[PDB]
């Protein structure tokens, strides 16, 4: 396995999104992982509709809550169940809950199944990232040390495995002798480092990064 992976170098990662007050991280994280497969299979890079997930997966069938939060694995299941998802350009992000208005004429991607990695297993996360591509994961983003992240490897002892925020692992590497996961957030380009964070890797499943890993198959 390469020391360093970074999926932007393969063109598989779209622009950082800003979710605002809508608890849509899960949706962002899930479109992220499917954008990557969608590049990797078709060769095109197209921001997928995180609104479509918000609007349409808000029922007990999934346990997603729209702006109330939800789960990247249930996002993937909705795409499978629904037979597609639109691009953002046709089903755009509004930062609120709205009535489902998914139109199959506008399908831009499909999902056939999704994979889950084993809980905590950072080795399994690395393989995935290396050979499969960006992977959806949950983090404990609840500390000001994460919010105000600027640089270096994020490695705050106060973090816990109690996850509450859906992000996308687009890579990994080593920095000044600290392993990291390159994480894409959905807090706009004023967060962390160009809207990214490098998060401790191989440090006891720091902030539960490897607790809840999944990615879709086309
Ligand atoms: C995003 N802006 C707010 N956070 C969420 O929607 C979180 C994301 N996930 S998780 O990554 O914390 C997780 C994923 C799989 C298994 C356990 C946790 C959960 C979601 C969340 O906080 N909730 C789900 C819906 O109801 C409220 C709690």
UniProtKB/Swiss-Prot annotation:
It comes from the Eukaryota. GO terms for cellular component: early endosome lumen; extracellular space; lysosome; membrane; phagocytic vesicle. Widely expressed with highest expression found in non-skeletal tissues. Relatively high levels found in skeletal tissues. Expressed in spleen, B cells, dendritic cells and macrophages. It is found in: Lysosome; Secreted; Cytoplasmic vesicle, Phagosome. Disulfide bonds join 12-111, 22-67, 56-100, 159-207. Its EC number is 3.4.22.27. It is an enzyme of class 3 (hydrolase). The active site is at 25, 165, 185. Keywords: Cytoplasmic vesicle, Disulfide bond, Glycoprotein, Hydrolase, Lysosome, Protease, Secreted, Signal, Thiol protease, Zymogen. GO terms for biological process: antigen processing and presentation of exogenous peptide antigen via MHC class II; basement membrane disassembly; positive regulation of cation channel activity; positive regulation of inflammatory response; proteolysis; proteolysis involved in protein catabolic process. One of its GO terms (molecular function) is peptidase activity. It catalyses: Similar to cathepsin L, but with much less activity on Z-Phe-Arg-|-NHMec, and more activity on the Z-Val-Val-Arg-|-Xaa compound. Its main location: other. Belongs to the peptidase C1 family. Thiol protease. Key protease responsible for the removal of the invariant chain from MHC class II molecules and MHC class II antigen presentation. The bond-specificity of this proteinase is in part similar to the specificities of cathepsin L. This is Cathepsin S.
